[PDB]
Every structure is written in structure tokens, then in C-alpha cells.
């Protein structure tokens, strides 16, 4: 009848009663996210309020056990979680009010629509309407209209919501003894009570900023090189020392420069590494895509997707009729129900994203065995990294020739390697300044360093300063351009994409030793490598039972994140860009903007 | 006597019992062709212990028992001699050396309804483990603390029965499997069950 024995029993009783109620909440949230109606929001609201009231009930019990008396840290960590108070602290009105705010933004993003000025009866959603424009259009004004109208007609709707969202999210965080909501989010990386492996929430900022400074020179030359090619694409619209206009970047916010490959390819005469045309030419559908991703994980010893996956997942836009959150989401609903929601198109982009969000699923499956509260990635960065391990191997030309998307005569040469490296760089390098900048803006807004008065002022200052991107149209404080992105608007921490980008090369480095691939790291393609998969698996099955600092060392041999593997990947491109830019400016001035005054 | 065994009554039953209160029916005065069971091939798990099925057909007993109940898929592994876990500790314990057979099949289409089927229970807590073939249906509130419970749930006081949640969408491990455990007995009394 010791305290530790009582807590084990109390967690066990919790783990068994908890599973179904979470499953119900997941199951209702699935209905809304697949099919936005007013009714499904009510049902989703009820399921989550039922689950929240359960936690508040258990939290009250959990808070009665003296935390410090628990010896085994695996048990101690579960008990610690159950004492959190979470959102229960919010008064009932303030609690219902924030839930209503979040649902209103969630719907606005996925169902907001801007109508054509010449014809007001033809209106366009974000997906597929506006995303397609930003991803394949070569006309400046068309891209400008899509970019600006989405910000002005939808972003301005989100502004008064985000304002009150910050206030309530701050209330809740500071009541759980965090310094702001940004602190709460950073607590995901926190490690406590483990000698030599602890990680302070403050340490995360130091590391992100310290690592970032080593990325700047690579990015600057990528930036300088893209601006050079862009200056030919859009003749009179680009300054040779200025920042890049935001709407010319390849997608809606310039998060991934991927679609700029067509304008920025180094060697156009060499066969195309963008297999989008081959996929279309070979009549691939989304079924073929996910089956080729399933086939991949199996090649390294991982399991097939469950029958319930193929049965219940939404892998194509349901149609005009049913209104769905078209953003790629990977779903662990509990009780062995795994699903993917993604409005797949026949592109190399979606082909690679299928491997990404399916890697997400494999991780969910691997740690299914853990006790309820430990079913989760080691940290947000780990989870968002497993898929990009695969995306790294799948995108390689050797793998693409392997699955028939490249002609069987195509053989690699140096121009081919550069082409591949450049495309990988547009996706992977380009997002790092974008990602870091955004999260810094939120952390400053949440902390209170940016007043409500200067949100959009300071936002675009940092876009020019850090990302090297300028707005094509001056935006006053009626806007809320951060909220126009899925993560900002749907309440998801974004720093998880920065850390995952450093993680994925550390993991790749350790896996290409396990497959004993010799050569440069950018030709790895771990496939048919049971030895590699088993090394990766042995870390996934742990879930969150071990601190990520430890689990990361178990694979790569590193207590912390490092950029050396990332820069070693792109090293051959790095020297190449330096030589291409010898007669071009590198860097930018914050002052030039593509408009008056 | 040449009455074929009412196996169809147990294996094809409209409804099965919750595992914590498993249901056993005695088969008497009957001729049992055991091969026709394995030759239905519907079953996912069909393991026999302490006897060979081939030899089992040409063999007589004073009485045969069939214990039926339902549990989760990944919990079927606990219906085997010398096993530990939530089911074999507080619900249905087979002896370590056991003569009998364990039969199970996926019951998803039958016992899981949309929205959830909760009528299926399982014992979650008990003071001590079950002896083999012991059966417990006490509804007294488990007490984990020095503080008494007064017959109600509360702090360190948990109602000992939990409810299974079966939806069609669950993973195979969480899906409902139906289990039939075949006991044989030999008394100082005339055998009433044989094969051809
Ligand atoms: C991971 O592991 C899988 C499984 O091993 C690999 O998939 C195999 O890939 C190889 C080659 O890609 C397949 O082998 C065969 O390749 C033939 C290519 O022809 C040859 O080219 C020249 C001559 O043209 C020669 O040097 C040499 O013979 C080459 O093999 C294909 O044309 C064959 O396809 C034929 O299959 C049937 C069988 O007779 C014929 O009827 C057809 O008409 C067709 O022509 C043949 O398939 C091998 O089959 C693949 N295995 C599987 C199970 O699919 C992956 O490549 C590997 N991945 C990585 C990254 O290593
Ligand atoms: C996307 O989500 C939307 C959600 O709005 C889905 O649209 C719904 O689709 C379902 C399909 O199952 C419809 O639900 C059905 O409604 C039937 C209506 O029946 C009426 O007559 C009955 C007379 O016997 C009466 O019982 C019934 O309800 C009343 O009594 C109930 C208690 O008995 C009570 O709970 C109700 O509140 C009400 O008072 C109706 O008057 C019903 O017979 C069916 O059993 C079933 O429930 C919804 O109507 C749809 N919602 C709409 C149209 O707004 C849509 O399908 C989803 N998309 C996809 C692809 O699935
Ligand atoms: C539980 O019920 C199922 C049926 O719902 C039983 O399976 C059935 O077994 C009988 C065996 O006599 C099968 O009948 C056979 O049909 C052929 C048809 O050509 C006939 O020629 C044979 O002589 C024989 O009579 C029947 O088809 C079969 N049904 C199904 C759907 O498989 C099952 O045996 C029952 N379980 C138990 C333990 O009794
Ligand atoms: C979570 O909220 C509860 C609200 O009850 C807090 O419990 C209270 O704590 C304060 C200070 O310790 C006391 O004045 C109250 O008496 C407590 N509650 C009750 C019911 O008496 C709890 O402190 C909060 N969580 C944390 C970590 O502080
Ligand atoms: C994963 O699923 C695939 C696709 O269903 C399986 O491939 C089939 O395997 C069976 C027998 O193993 C063959 O008869 C089929 O022709 C295969 N292709 C199909 C059905 O399209 C594969 O075996 C599964 N792998 C694992 C490990 O379960
Ligand atoms: C690629 O670069 C190597 C580096 O040593 C160089 O020697 C060679 O010219 C190139 N290989 C080709 C063109 O096949
Ligand atoms: Zn992801």
C-alpha cells in the first residue's frame, strides 16, 4: 500500500477508462475535419468537453499524490502529466469562448473563399483554387491577386480572433506557471530530473538561434542564386539587391521554394528529376502513390498499413459537396485506428508528402504498445522528422529509377547531382529562415515584446530582415498575415519544423552507416535495408518513455541537435552556388520594396 | 446413443457472456466429431494442449465442457497455460498443465456496433489472482488505500468492473474476439461423450 503502488494502480485505472473517451473525441474530430457542418462542430464540441471534464476529474485526484515520492521516472512522468490543470483553469465562459474562437478560425481557413473581381460568381478556395495559382502561375499580377486577396479578405477576418486568442491562450498558460503561451509550447522539448540530459525551455531558443547562424551563409547564396534566375522570370519586378517579393516564392506564403525548380533549374537539358510529369504520364492516382509509400516502408521491415487505414482514410478531395480540411494530417485516434487525411493530387510533391505523413503513421504504430500517456513522439521535432527521413531516400534519382518514374537509361552525372541538390535545397533550406522567423514572431507576440499596435509592422520588418522576403503591398494593422497560414490559424506550434530539419540528417547519417552505403550522404536511399529500419524502429517503439536527448544519442550519438549533418548534405551545392554567384550580389537590403514610398 | 453434439449451440450462439462472468455448458450423452470443428476453418486460433486432436476424435470421456466468453484480440494470447496479464489474472485462468483446447475467432461484425458496444465487461482489479477455472463476479469496490471506501467510487477507490468499447473502426487488437475453451473430464462414472 505504498504511495508508488497506489499511483501505479491509479494510472492503470486511468489508462483503461481514458482510452475510449479519447477515441470518441478523435472520432468526432475526424467527422468535422472530413466534413465541416454546423452539426459536426456541435458533436465535436461535446466529445472534447466530455474528455476535458474527465481530465479535470482525474487531475484533481492526481494532484493528491505527492509527486516527489515517485522513484521510477517513467511512472513519475505520467503522474506529472495528470496534474497539469491544462485548460480547466479557464473560467467556464472563458473556456467556451476560446473553444468557439479556435473552431471559427479552423473553419475560416479551410472554407474561406475569395471571388474573382471580373466575375463575382466564380469563387476560389485555398485548396485547390489558390494553392494551384501560387504553385504554377507565371504572371505577376495573377500571383499578386491570389496572394493579396487571401490576406485581405480572409486574413482580416482572423485578426480580431487572433487578438483574443492570444489573450486567452496567455491566460491559460500563465495560470499553469509558464511565462507565456510560447513557453508552454517550448515545454515539449523540456527534460527534467535526468543528470546530464536535462533540457531547459530557455535552452531551446539558444540552440535554435545558434544553429541558425551556421545556416545563414548557405541560405544567402541560395537566396542570391534564386533572385538571379527570378530576375529573368519576372523582368522588371525584381531588384538585384532587394528582397524577394513574397508572392513569387512558389506557394501561398513562401514556406517551400519547391515550385521554383522550373525557373531555377541549373541544367535544363538533363532529364527531369521532377517526376510530376512522369507520374501524370503513367496515369498514377492517389491509390498508386500511397501504395508506393506503403511498399517503401515494407522494404525496410516495417508493417503494412492496417486494414482500417485503407478503409477509413480520406486520400482525395471529397468533392464540391463535402467540405473538408484539405491540409495533410496524420491521425492516431487510439484503439488501433490509424488514418491519413490528404487531398492528394498527382504531383511529386504529393508523392513525397505521402511518404512523409505515412512515416508519421509508422511512428504512431510503433509505440502503440506504450502506456497511454507515453504514446507520442519523443518531441514534436522527432515526429515531424521520421517522414522526412523517408522523403530524403524516396526523392533520390536512384530510388526514382528503381520505381520506374525515371527512364531506365538515365544515369547520374554531376549536372544531375546538382539538379537534385538544388531542388532538395529549395524545399529544405528555404524553409529554415521562413520557419524560424515565424516562430520568433509568435514567441514575441506571446511574450508581449510586440504590442498589439505593431503586429504587422514588426512582422514584415522580420520578413525583410531574416527571410529576405518583402511584401508586394503595404499592410496596415487591419491584416493578420501570420494567421493566413494553417498552423498559426489552427493552433499548432511551428518550431517543430525547424528542429526536424536538423534531426533528419542526423538520423540519415546514422542510417546510411547501418545500410553501409558508401559515398556522399545525398545518394543514400535506405531501401531493402532491414538493418536500417530495425535501428530506426528500436527508437520509435520508445515513444515518449525516454527523454529525446537520450533517445537521439542512442541512434546518432548526440545529446543535442547539430547542423553539421545538414550542411554536409548540401556541401557540394554550397561550393557550386558560391561559384555561380561570383558576378551576383549576395545578401539583401531591407529598404527596397516593390511599391511606392 | 448417436446424438450429434450441440456444438452449434455454443459456437453459433446469438450472444456471448462477458469474460469476467464466463459461461460454461456441459456436453453429455452425445457423440462428438471433433474434426468437423477444425474443418469449419473459420477460426483464427485453434490450439490444443495435453492431447492431440487427431487422437482426440477416437477417445471417450464422462463429460465435456465448453466455456464461452469474449475479449480483445490481442488479449487472446492470455487464454493459454501459464500466462499473465489482465485477463488471466482476474478473469479466466487456465492451469499451467492443461488438457483441453482453446478456440477463438474474430467477432467484429457480430459484437461491435457503430457508436460502441459496452455490454461486454472485464474485471480490472482484484485482491489476488484467480486459481484455475475460478470465477469472480463480486461488485465490491476495490480499495487501494488505507482509507475505506464506503461502497462508492472515489479517491483510491475504483469500481472493479470496466467496460469494453467495440466500434467497427477499431484496430484488430482492440476488436472483439470470441473464445471457446474445451474442457474434458474423466470420472469414476460411465463415459457419456465419444467420437465415432
Ligand atoms: C529493392 O528490392 C527490390 C526487389 O528485389 C528491387 O526491385 C527489383 O528491381 C529489379 C531491377 O529494377 C527487377 O529485376 C528485373 O529488372 C529487369 C531490368 O532488365 C535488365 O536490364 C538489363 C537488360 O535490359 C540487364 O542488365 C539486367 O537483366 C536487368 O535486370 C526488368 O526488365 C525485369 O522485369 C521483367 O519481369 C518479368 C519476369 O520475366 C517479365 O515478364 C517482364 O516483361 C519484365 O521485362 C525484372 O523485374 C526485379 O524484378 C525487382 N524485384 C521486384 C520484386 O519487383 C528494387 O529495385 C530494390 N530497390 C533498391 C533501391 O535497391
Ligand atoms: C457530413 O455531415 C453532415 C452532418 O450534418 C451529414 O448530413 C447528415 O446526414 C445524416 C445521414 O445519416 C442525416 O441523419 C439522418 O436524419 C434522418 C432524419 O429523420 C427525421 O425523421 C425522423 C422520424 O422518425 C426523426 O427521428 C429525425 O430526428 C429527430 O428525432 C431524433 C430522436 O429520435 C432526434 O435525435 C433528432 O434531433 C430529431 O429530433 C428526423 O426528424 C434520420 O432518420 C436518420 O436516422 C439519420 O439520423 C442528417 O439529416 C444529415 N444532416 C443534414 C442534412 O443537415 C452528412 O451526411 C455528412 N457527410 C457524409 C459524406 O457523411
Ligand atoms: C454454425 O452455422 C454454420 C452455418 O451458418 C454451420 O456451417 C454449416 O455446416 C453444414 C454442415 O452440415 C453445411 O451443410 C453442408 O452443405 C452441403 C451443401 O452442398 C451439403 O452437401 C452437406 O452434406 C452439408 O449438409 C453448411 O453448408 C454450413 N454452412 C455454412 C454457411 O458454412 C456451422 O457448422 C455451425 N457451427 C457448428 C459448431 O455447428
Ligand atoms: C489547479 O487548479 C486547482 C484549483 O483547485 C489548484 O488547487 C488549488 O491550489 C491553491 C494553492 O495551492 C489552493 O489555494 C486551493 O485550495 C487549491 N484547490 C482546492 C480545491 O482547494 C491547483 O493549485 C492548480 N494547479 C497548480 C499546479 O497549482
Ligand atoms: C502488404 O499488402 C500487400 C498488398 O495487399 C501484400 O501483397 C499481396 O501479397 C499476397 C500474398 O502475400 C499476394 O497473393 C498478392 O498478389 C499481393 N498483392 C496484392 C494483394 O495486390 C503484401 O504481401 C503485404 N505484406 C505484408 C508484410 O503483410
Ligand atoms: C564530377 O566531379 C568530379 C570531381 O572529382 C570531376 O572530376 C568530374 O569531372 C565529374 N564527373 C563527371 C563529369 O562524370
Ligand atoms: Zn508531418
Author numbering:
A (entry chain A): 19 to 615
B (entry chain B): 332 to 527
Text of the article:
Angiotensin-converting enzyme 2 (ACE2) is lineage B clade 1 specific receptor including SARS-CoV-23. The protease domain (PD) of ACE2 is known to harbor the interface to viral spike protein, located in the top-middle part of ACE2 ectodomain. Similar to anti-receptor binding domain (RBD) antibodies, extracellular domain of ACE2, soluble ACE2 (sACE2), can also be used to neutralize SARS-CoV-2 as a decoy receptor.
In this work, we perform directed evolution for ACE2 in 293T cells and achieve ~100-fold higher binding affinity for the RBD. The crystal structure of the complex was solved at 3.2-Å resolution. Our structural data show that the enhanced affinity comes from better hydrophobic packing and hydrogen-bonding geometry at the interface. In contrast, mutation sites K31N and E35K are located at the center of the binding interface. In the WT structure, E35 forms an intramolecular salt bridge with the K31 in the preceding helical turn (right), making it less favorable for forming direct intermolecular hydrogen bonding with Q493 in the RBD. As for L79F and A25V, both mutations are conservative in nature but accompany acquisition of larger sidechains. In WT ACE2, L79 forms a small hydrophobic pocket with Y83 and M82 that accommodates F486 of RBD, which has been suggested to be a key determinant of SARS-CoV-2 that gives higher affinity than SARS-CoV-1 (right). In addition, A25V mutation fills a space at the back of the pocket together with L97 (left). Additional disulfide mutations caused the fixing of a closed ACE2 conformation to avoid off-target effects of protease activity, and also improved structural stability.
